[PDB]
Design a protein around this ligand. Structure first.
Ligand SMILES: CCCCCCCCCCCCCCCCCC(=O)OC[C@H](COP(=O)([O-])OCC(O)COP(=O)([O-])OC[C@@H](COC(=O)CCCCCCCCCCCCCCCCC)OC(=O)CCCCCCCCCCCCCCCCC)OC(=O)CCCCCCCCCCCCCCCCC
Ligand SMILES: CCCCCCCCCCCCCCCCCC(=O)OC[C@H](COP(=O)([O-])OCC[N+](C)(C)C)OC(=O)CCCCCCCCCCCCCCCCC
Ligand SMILES: CCCCCCCCCCCCCCCCCC(=O)OC[C@H](COP(=O)([O-])OCC[N+](C)(C)C)OC(=O)CCCCCCCCCCCCCCCCC
Ligand SMILES: CCCCCCCCCCCCCCCCCC(=O)OC[C@H](COP(=O)(O)OCCN)OC(=O)CCCCCCCCCCCCCCCCC
Ligand SMILES: CCCCCCCCCCCCCCCCCC(=O)OC[C@H](COP(=O)(O)OCCN)OC(=O)CCCCCCCCCCCCCCCCC
Ligand SMILES: CCCCCCCCCCCCCCCCCC(=O)OC[C@H](COP(=O)(O)OCCN)OC(=O)CCCCCCCCCCCCCCCCC
Ligand SMILES: CCCCCCCCCCCCCCCCCC(=O)OC[C@H](COP(=O)(O)OCCN)OC(=O)CCCCCCCCCCCCCCCCC
Ligand SMILES: CCCCCCCCCCCCCCCCCC(=O)OC[C@H](COP(=O)(O)OCCN)OC(=O)CCCCCCCCCCCCCCCCC
Ligand SMILES: CCCCCCCCCCCCCCCCCC(=O)OC[C@H](COP(=O)(O)OCCN)OC(=O)CCCCCCCCCCCCCCCCC
Ligand SMILES: CCCCCCCCCCCCCCCCCC(=O)OC[C@H](COP(=O)(O)OCCN)OC(=O)CCCCCCCCCCCCCCCCC
Ligand SMILES: CCCCCCCCCCCCCCCCCC(=O)OC[C@H](COP(=O)(O)OCCN)OC(=O)CCCCCCCCCCCCCCCCC
Lengths: 331, 120, 19, 64, 57, 459, 99, 63, 173
């Protein structure tokens, strides 16, 4: 336990150190992209040790290390869930982020603000790891909105371009519409189950879960750009290509799917939500694949490919195969 | 209401019975405020006549403070006398009319019924 | 810019027999 | 300057109460308020009726 | 000049600090007028410690 | 409270007796020292409020409002001293005096034990506020703004005076502790309906309530920067503080008397949020943003749940720092281009990099990015309102979408795109301006670490 | 010319006469002191020491005490087969119902 | 902009670093109080109901 | 540290290693590296600190509140008695919030501990959570932001009247 928990946390703390050092304490400009890229590669290595331990024996644990706030009978504590989904996804996300940062060192070489670019990429990764390891819905919402705002800032990187600002605000618009569903689920869980913790939600296992699950489905629809709230994802190709590779193809856009996977103990007992997510994913995968057939911008084709693949992940949710949906996220 | 009090010595600033009351303390916060008003009047007098506000005519400023404090002291003595008389009249009347001011037989909350209005 | 203060046009509103 | 002035200060002086403005103001002003009053008043009266009859599930509802 | 002129430059800086001390002092004097229930509430009333004469001031 | 009242009063002789060139240094330094001592008000107990004397007390509701109030005075002195630089000495000192007197009335307002003492100081704040708007405002419209401000407030507050005196005659006391034990339920009669309205309309106008808010876009826009800071940060919260107190004696009538005001607020917040999307004046947009946020506080106070009361207290504090920061950010552009039009100066991120970071942080708190205390307050209100009626989540959800849109529209229009070619006097940001912005945002984000101290008595 | 009124003065650039200006005052010495008091009393004192003071507030509003008290009661009541909590807040023997 | 951030960092560290060192020294060489039953007939001071030495100093000095 | 009865946990059952592979186990060698490089120097520093604390040992106490008469025994409008009863009721109310939190913490620790078998093996914790939440809801739910002992008492009597009425017409049948 003592090694598992120590190393799982240091992975997260290690990524925050390049952020703190940009308080002009040890800061030197020229080496900064290499510094951030090196921290990612070490975070990948430290993340493999807890992953090996889970693979070996299935070890899982929850760390509720800091008590933040008690509201009468709702105790909110910073808590991390080191389980199947977070043990497998973290090394995969760090491995891919490692390559994209090395690629960015070449692609963005002539950008005068390359240090700010690497800071923003790192901030996205931190908020994504907060999202993946979150054990309560409030902490999840922190990561949920964190990636949204970093997405907004990276899409509108070239802020003199009117089209880039429009696309950046478009992503916020569609994602805030999805956030209404997220807020709905939090309100329902608090009112009906007196909790935002996943443990208590799964223990109480409500049978009348249509309303909270519909909220979570609406949240997924925006974050994973399913049909209805889909247009923002191809528009986000306004960003520099390293942004598209990381956020809007590999990691940020799977957060809607990931949210539904975390709540599979509720969706698996609800055939109505399975039917909704099945059809929603099916129309998304077909519609966006069809759009991809005629696009001439290479990034638009790959972007519509992502939407179509996300639709297939949502179909896997709808047929009650959450672990296959997670595997497709990783591959 | 108190114009025709039975023991009203008419047209007297401070009737003799007022001498049984404790005088206002010279450190009374109300008397200190009256002195402060006197000091403000002294500053205004300098200002309207375009003298240096803080320094000009310190003798005049002193008489502003003294006269306000002097008049304030007697007005507070009458003020305290008039409220003492009000209380004296009130308690005498209550004693003379016990049938109008009965001591209530007052119950505990365990016995009295209050409706509950849920906030939901 | 400098703080606006009443001009002759504003002030003449108060110079009539009635408001 | 003309554009910002026309979009604010100049509007009321050129406003006339008539059939068009009175109806639109009533429809856009009061309409939504009356509508939302009857949605919430109806929903809360139904919910209140169920709670008094013990027919609303509030098993774990202790935060409000 | 030293001391003088320095004092003339900077004597205003005692006003607010002395206001706080005086305000603090008057707050204590008001507490001495509200002692009707000192060591007499049902919750906290107790026997006085040998040397002690009041439970609070 | 005398340990705060007397030092505040001493700021006046300090200002008047200071060397001519040290009026800003002296008043700023000592007002910060007073703000530092206000942290001693954080001696709050789980059961009992901190009751100083017959006149004053502080509980978990008034304590954060007091700390915010005393914090704002040095910030306002910093924000004002540039645009008053050519004012003659005596008029500068009178301007500072109005700010000090406003602080004196406010800290006594928030700690008054007796509702009629609360009333007198609650109205007292009008006088210095009116003088600041009309004397030191910049445009012709400041005179009209002062009248709307004055007569909207008094139209409501004079009926409140009659109600309060009526309550004292019937209960025998207006002392707030006594009313907690002697409060009786309100029977449902026509006479009690108008008592309820008398006790609430004055506070509703100050929030402001949608429909009764027309004074705010005038007053908040025409005031000098210090006037706008205190008007939005603190004075709007007198209405919220007053409502949170007086609802104690209005149950159970609030159950049904709340409905018309909940509808005005829930629909009003969507209306005023939409207005922000088409505002052409940057200061006017920020002013309409306040109306939308305070609509949530009105709704939270009227549904009277422990969660809505914690959320309302957090929002009032969170909005105070955020709205004041936005006005200061908008003012810093105004001091350069001398116009409040939002489309006039564009692409300012290219010319003022660090100032564009303050704009971003101010915008993110305005749209309630978690885990900011802006979000914590808004979330708690949304949670409680969902329990009041599930359907409210639609109106709350739409408002959060619109709020994100106008918050980032303001950011994009002014900070991004291409700079305006002919505007060539955008000098670098002064140390004073940068310190002024960071003294807003730094305390705001620090409170995220220890939110309980701004969650009010229900925590 | 219509009335005698001064023309509007041109806006002064504090940096022009003082490239090291902090924006507080035209006098360079007063300008520096205004910066120092703001930064010292603002950041060094209020924000840093105030943050520390808030961090070490002695059990703000009794939350830690209540947790210790709840642990004590739960230990006692379970050790005696009593319910952890009762529906009645007040003993029914002290209450006299109507009718 | 660079000068401001330098000044901001200096003045936060001017007291920040001394406080962090003081807190560490207090935590190491004084530590926290140990919970104990109230000795029979003993009346603790109001500040003896708190754990951390800084907390009980605040309670004793100011509250 | 904490009392094991208040925050219970079942005995730990760890299977012994039983490899069937010649390959070395990387975790075993990482575990020994962790002990030498991390746990050992960290333990030494802690022991140094605990020696300093042992030189200066001082105590703090859990405050005890004497019981005072409650609101049911207070005469109407008698603020001095109502005040002491209301403060006691608020202290009890905060305590009851923490009791529910303790029971919730047990429930969540059980669900995580039992893994895929939690639905069966946490039945006791679920039952205790259900009972305490019902009792807490009976005491304090629906009082409103301006709650008090008086309103709590009014709510209890309304419930007692209903339970008394449902009995005379359940004993008549
Ligand atoms: C940075 C700024 C923020 C933190 C500043 C406060 C610093 C506090 C530091 C401190 O006191 O903790 C020290 C710690 C305290 O002792 P403790 O008994 O554990 O804690 C006492 C209480 O239980 C708990 O004490 P407490 O209640 O006072 O804790 C205060 C709290 C934080 O609270 C505060 O201190 C003040 C908060 C102010 C607000 C800060 C906001 C800043 C953020 C702005 C946004 O601490 C933290 O959370 C900070 C740590 C996380 C970062 O003890 C030590 O000094 C050593 C611990 C670390 C040892 C690591 C192992 C290294 C050894 C291995 C290598 C060498 C081996 C050689 C071979 C062997 C030979 C022997
Ligand atoms: C030269 C003297 C000029 C005085 C007459 C011109 C001013 C008359 C109007 C005065 C202001 C308006 C009315 C004020 C009422 C206050 C009266 C009061 O309360 O005090 C009277 C008190 C109390 O008298 P009382 O109790 O019998 O009733 C006063 C009359 N009522 C109640 C109707 C108001 O009497 C005295 O002050 C003592 C008389 C002293 C006489 C000294 C006169 C000045 C010469 C030295
Ligand atoms: C990500 C960013 C960095 C994260 C760092 C995390 C680690 C930080 C350590 C930490 O948590 O700190 C300890 C605490 C939180 O953790 P804690 O509550 O457990 O405290 C730790 C100390 N012990 C163990 C003794 C309890 O932080 C704070 O309390 C900071 C409170 C600051 C809020 C007050 C700001 C002062 C404002 C002055 C007034 C003027 C502004 C106007 C105010 C308006 C009205 C209110
Ligand atoms: C839903 C949840 C949402 C939460 C969102 C919150 C957003 C805010 C930003 C997140 C920051 C997370 C910081 C987490 C790590 C720091 C934890 C910490 O501050 O330590 C405090 C801890 C107090 O213990 P605790 O009982 O948990 O606190 C209750 C009062 N709140 O102190 C301790 O117990 C021990 C501290 C001593 C540590 C000694 C080690 C020192 C090492 C040398 C210095 C480095
Ligand atoms: C307030 C603004 C109002 C303006 C202020 C007016 C100041 C009035 C001055 C009163 C002070 C007089 C001091 C003189 C005392 C004295 O030494 O001489 C006594 C003499 C009367 O002696 P007497 O009591 O009648 O006979 C003794 C036998 N028993 O004394 C006298 O002759 C009495 C003098 C007549 C006073 C008339 C009543 C004074 C009240 C004026 C109105 C007060 C308004 C208060 C408003 C309340 C809101 C603040
Ligand atoms: C409540 C408190 C109200 C107190 C009223 C005080 C009395 C009325 C103001 C007196 C000050 C004044 O009228 O003139 C302003 C004066 C200007 O000074 P100067 O003309 O140069 O004279 C030489 C100074 N030795 O100023 C000075 O230099 C003298 C110092 C006193 C200034 C007092 C400022 C009064 C402003 C009060 C406004 C209302 C407060 C709320
Ligand atoms: C013996 C001769 C006969 C006359 C004697 C009468 C004396 C009493 C009358 C009142 C006069 C009080 C003393 C006034 C001192 C004024 C001296 C002065 O004007 O010098 C100015 C002095 C320093 O200013 P400086 O440094 O030179 O220049 C600064 C540029 N801004 O600035 C100062 O330091 C002045 C400080 C303010 C003045 C003191 C304020 C007194 C407040 C009185 C409150 C009244 C309360 C009454 C309560 C009584 C209740 C019993
Ligand atoms: C409820 C009131 C509903 C009003 C119904 C419409 C009444 C109407 O149409 O009367 C028309 C009359 C003038 O008609 P006329 O002069 O012939 O104009 C012809 C040219 N089109 O109109 C008039 O000249 C009289 C003016 C009538 C005033 C109508 C009042 C309602 C206006 C909307 C108020 C908005 C309230 C704000 C709600 C809070 C949120 C914003
Ligand atoms: C209980 C809940 C309360 C909440 C709801 C409050 C509703 C809002 C109340 C608004 C009050 C009226 C509007 C006040 C805004 C300021 C008025 C204004 O500025 O109008 C300007 C108008 C133009 O004329 P003027 O300014 O004189 O020309 C330039 C020379 N100065 O000036 C004029 O023509 C003269 C204006 C006179 C009106 C002055 C305000 C008095 C308001 C009280 C009305 C009294 C009614 C008494 C009638 C009783 C008999 C029926
Ligand atoms: C734009 C101007 C801005 C200024 C706005 C000023 C707002 C002032 C509002 C004053 C209205 C106060 C209500 C006075 C009517 C009398 C109230 C009353 O006593 O009726 C009781 C009854 C309660 O009904 P019930 O809940 O069934 O009883 C308990 C059993 N469950 O009654 C009920 O059925 C409760 C419902 C009463 C509320 C009706 C709501 C009407 C529809 C919403 C309108 C929104 C506001 C419209 C403002 C437009 C102004 C032009
Ligand atoms: C062997 C001991 C060596 C300790 C080295 C520490 C040096 C750095 C801290 C400097 C502050 C002075 C510390 C002096 C400690 C002397 C007191 C002591 O050692 O006894 C333990 C005592 C707690 O015991 P207690 O029972 O609560 O109090 C008894 C009352 N007579 O202790 C206390 O009461 C705590 C007193 C300190 C708490 C107040 C400090 C101010 C709060 C801010 C802390 C930030 C760090 C301070 C450094 C300056 C910051 C600018």
């Amino acid at each position: 336990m003592n090694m598992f928990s120590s190393l799982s946390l240091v992975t997260l703390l290690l990524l925050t150190m390049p952020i703190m050092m940009m308080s002009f304490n040890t800061y030197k400009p020229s080496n900064y992209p290499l510094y951030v890229k090196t921290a990612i590669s070490y975070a990948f290595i430290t993340s493999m040790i807890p992953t090996m331990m889970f693979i070996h024996s299935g070890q899982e644990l929850i760390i509720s290390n800091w008590h933040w706030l008690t509201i009468q009978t709702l105790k909110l504590s910073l808590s991390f869930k080191m389980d199947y989904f977070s043990m497998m996804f973290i090394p995969v996300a760090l491995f891919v982020t490692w390559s994209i940062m090395e690629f960015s060192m070449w692609y963005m070489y002539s950008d005068p603000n390359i240090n700010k670019f690497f800071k923003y990429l790192l901030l996205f990764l931190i908020t994504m790891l907060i999202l993946v390891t979150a054990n309560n819905l409030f902490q999840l919402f922190i990561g949920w909105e964190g990636v949204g705002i970093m997405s907004f800032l990276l899409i509108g990187w070239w802020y003199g371009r009117a089209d880039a600002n429009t696309a950046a605000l478009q992503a916020i618009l569609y994602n805030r519409i999805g956030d209404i569903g997220f807020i709905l689920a939090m309100a329902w869980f608090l009112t009906n189950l007196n909790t935002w913790d996943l443990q208590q939600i799964f223990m109480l296992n409500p049978s009348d879960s249509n309303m909270p699950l519909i909220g979570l489905a609406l949240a997924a629809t925006g974050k994973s750009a399913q049909f209805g709230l889909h247009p923002w994802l191809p528009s986000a190709m306004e960003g520099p290509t390293p942004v598209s590779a990381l956020l809007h193809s590999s990691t940020m856009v799977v957060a809607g799917i990931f949210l539904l996977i975390r709540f599979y103990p509720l969706t698996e007992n609800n055939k109505y939500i399975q039917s909704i997510t099945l059809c929603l994913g099916a129309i998304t995968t077909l519609f966006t694949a069809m759009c991809a057939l005629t696009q001439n911008d290479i990034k638009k084709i790959i972007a519509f490919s992502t939407s179509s693949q996300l639709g297939l992940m949502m179909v896997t949710i709808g047929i009650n195969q959450p672990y296959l949906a997670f595997l497709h996220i990783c591959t | 209401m108190m114009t025709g009090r039975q023991g009203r010595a008419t047209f007297q600033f401070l009737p003799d019975e007022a001498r049984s009351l404790p005088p206002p303390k010279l450190t009374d916060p109300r008397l200190a405020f009256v002195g402060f008003l006197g000091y403000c009047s002294g500053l205004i007098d300098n200002a309207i006549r375009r003298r240096p506000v803080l320094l000009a005519g310190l003798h005049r400023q002193l008489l502003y403070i003294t006269s306000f404090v002097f008049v304030g002291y007697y007005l507070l003595k009458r003020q305290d006398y008039m409220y003492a008389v009000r209380d004296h009249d009130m308690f005498s009347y209550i004693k003379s009319h016990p049938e109008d001011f009965p001591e209530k037989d007052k119950k505990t909350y365990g016995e009295v019924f209050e409706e509950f209005h849920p906030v939901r | 810019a400098r703080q606006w203060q009443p001009d002759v046009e504003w002030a003449e509103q108060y110079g009539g027999a009635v408001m | 300057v003309r554009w910002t002035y026309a979009r604010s200060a100049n509007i009321y002086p050129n406003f006339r109460p008539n059939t068009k403005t009175s109806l639109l103001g009533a429809l856009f002003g009061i309409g939504p308020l009356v509508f939302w009053y009857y949605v919430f008043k109806t929903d809360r009266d139904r919910k209140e009726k169920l709670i008094q009859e013990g027919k609303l599930d509030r098993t774990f509802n202790i935060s409000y | 000049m030293n001391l003088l002129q320095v004092v003339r430059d900077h004597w205003v800086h005692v006003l607010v600090p002395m206001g706080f001390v005086f305000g603090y002092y008057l707050d204590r004097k008001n507490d001495e007028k509200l002692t009707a229930f000192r060591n007499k509430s049902l919750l906290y009333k107790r026997e006085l410690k040998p040397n002690e004469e009041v439970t609070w001031k | 409270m005398l340990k705060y009242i007397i030092p505040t009063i001493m700021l006046m002789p300090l200002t008047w007796l200071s060397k001519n060139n040290m009026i800003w240094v002296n008043s700023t330094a000592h007002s910060l020292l007073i703000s530092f001592t206000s942290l001693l008000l954080m001696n709050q107990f789980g059961d009992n409020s901190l009751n100083f004397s017959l006149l004053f007390f502080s509980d978990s509701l008034s304590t954060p409002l007091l700390i915010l109030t005393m914090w704002l005075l040095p910030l306002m002195l910093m924000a004002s001293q540039h645009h008053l630089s050519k004012e003659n000495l005596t008029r500068k000192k009178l301007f500072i005096t109005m700010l000090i007197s406003l602080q004196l009335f406010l800290i006594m307002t928030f700690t008054a034990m007796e509702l009629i003492l609360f009333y007198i100081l609650f109205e007292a704040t009008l006088v210095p506020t009116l003088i600041i708007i009309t004397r030191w405002g910049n445009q012709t419209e400041r005179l009209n703004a002062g009248l709307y401000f004055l007569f909207y407030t008094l139209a409501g507050s004079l009926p409140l005076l009659v109600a309060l005196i009526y309550i004292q005659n019937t209960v025998g006391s207006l002392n707030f502790l006594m009313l907690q034990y002697w409060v009786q339920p309100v029977h449902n009669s026509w006479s009690n309906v108008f008592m309820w309205l008398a006790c609430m309309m004055a506070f509703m106008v100050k929030m402001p309530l949608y429909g009764l808010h027309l004074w705010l876009p005038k007053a908040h826009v025409e005031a000098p920067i210090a006037g706008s800071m205190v008007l939005a940060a603190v004075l709007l919260k007198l209405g919220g503080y007053g409502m949170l107190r007086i609802t104690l004696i209005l149950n159970p009538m609030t159950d049904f008397m709340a409905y018309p005001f909940i509808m005005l607020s829930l629909w009003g917040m969507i209306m005023t949020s939409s207005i922000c999307l088409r505002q052409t004046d940057l200061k006017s947009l920020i002013a309409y943003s306040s109306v939308s946020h305070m609509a949530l506080v009105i709704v939270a106070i009227l549904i009277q749940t422990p969660w809505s009361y914690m959320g309302a207290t957090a929002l009032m504090i969170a909005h105070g720092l955020t709205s004041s920061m936005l006005f200061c950010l908008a003012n810093s552009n105004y001091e350069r281009i001398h116009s409040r039009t939002m489309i006039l100066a564009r692409g300012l991120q290219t010319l003022l990099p660090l100032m564009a970071t303050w704009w971003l942080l101010a915008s993110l708190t305005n749209l309630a990015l978690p885990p900011t205390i802006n979000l914590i307050g808004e979330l708690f209100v949304v949670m409680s309102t969902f329990s009041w009626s599930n359907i409210t989540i639609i109106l709350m959800g739409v408002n959060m979408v619109i709020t994100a849109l106008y918050s980032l529209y303001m950011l994009i229009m002014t900070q991004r795109g291409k700079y305006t070619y002919h505007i060539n006097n955008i000098s670098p940001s002064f140390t004073r301006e940068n310190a002024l912005m960071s003294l807003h945002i730094l305390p705001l984000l620090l409170l995220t670490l220890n939110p309980k101290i701004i969650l009010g008595p229900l925590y | 010319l219509r009335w005698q009124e001064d023309p509007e003065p041109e806006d002064e650039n504090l940096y022009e006469k003082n490239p090291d200006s902090h924006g507080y005052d035209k006098d360079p010495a007063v300008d520096i002191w205004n910066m120092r008091v703001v930064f010292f009393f603002g950041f060094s004192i209020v924000l840093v020491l105030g943050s520390t003071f808030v961090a070490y507030l002695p059990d703000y509003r009794m939350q830690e005490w209540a947790r210790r008290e709840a642990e004590r009661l739960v230990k006692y009541r379970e050790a005696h087969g009593l319910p952890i909590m009762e529906s009645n807040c007040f003993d029914p023997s002290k209450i006299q119902l109507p009718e | 902009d660079k000068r401001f951030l330098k000044l901001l960092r200096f003045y936060i560290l001017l007291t920040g670093i001394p406080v962090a060192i003081g807190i560490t020294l207090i935590n190491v060489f004084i530590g926290e109080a140990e919970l104990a039953e109230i000795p029979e007939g003993y009346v603790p001071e109001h500040w003896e109901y708190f754990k951390h030495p800084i907390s009980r100093w605040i309670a004793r000095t100011f509250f | 540290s904490w009392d094991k009865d208040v925050y219970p946990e079942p005995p730990r059952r760890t299977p012994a290693p039983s490899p069937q592979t010649s390959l070395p186990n990387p975790i075993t060698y990482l575990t020994k590296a962790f002990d030498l490089l991390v746990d050992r120097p960290v333990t030494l520093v802690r022991e140094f600190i605990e020696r300093q604390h042992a030189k200066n040992k001082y105590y703090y106490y859990h405050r005890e509140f004497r019981r005072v008469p409650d609101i049911t025994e207070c005469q109407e409008k008698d603020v001095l008695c109502m005040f002491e009863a209301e403060m006691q009721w608020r202290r009890d109310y905060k305590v009851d919030q923490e009791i529910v939190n303790i029971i919730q913490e047990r429930l969540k620790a059980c669900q995580q501990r039992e893994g895929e078998s939690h639905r069966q093996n946490c039945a006791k914790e679920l039952e205790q959570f259900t009972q305490v939440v019902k009792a807490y809801q009976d005491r304090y739910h629906d009082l409103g932001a301006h709650y008090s002992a008086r309103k709590c008492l009014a709510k209890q009597k309304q419930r007692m009247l209903a339970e008394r009425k449902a009995a005379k017409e359940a004993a008549a049948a």
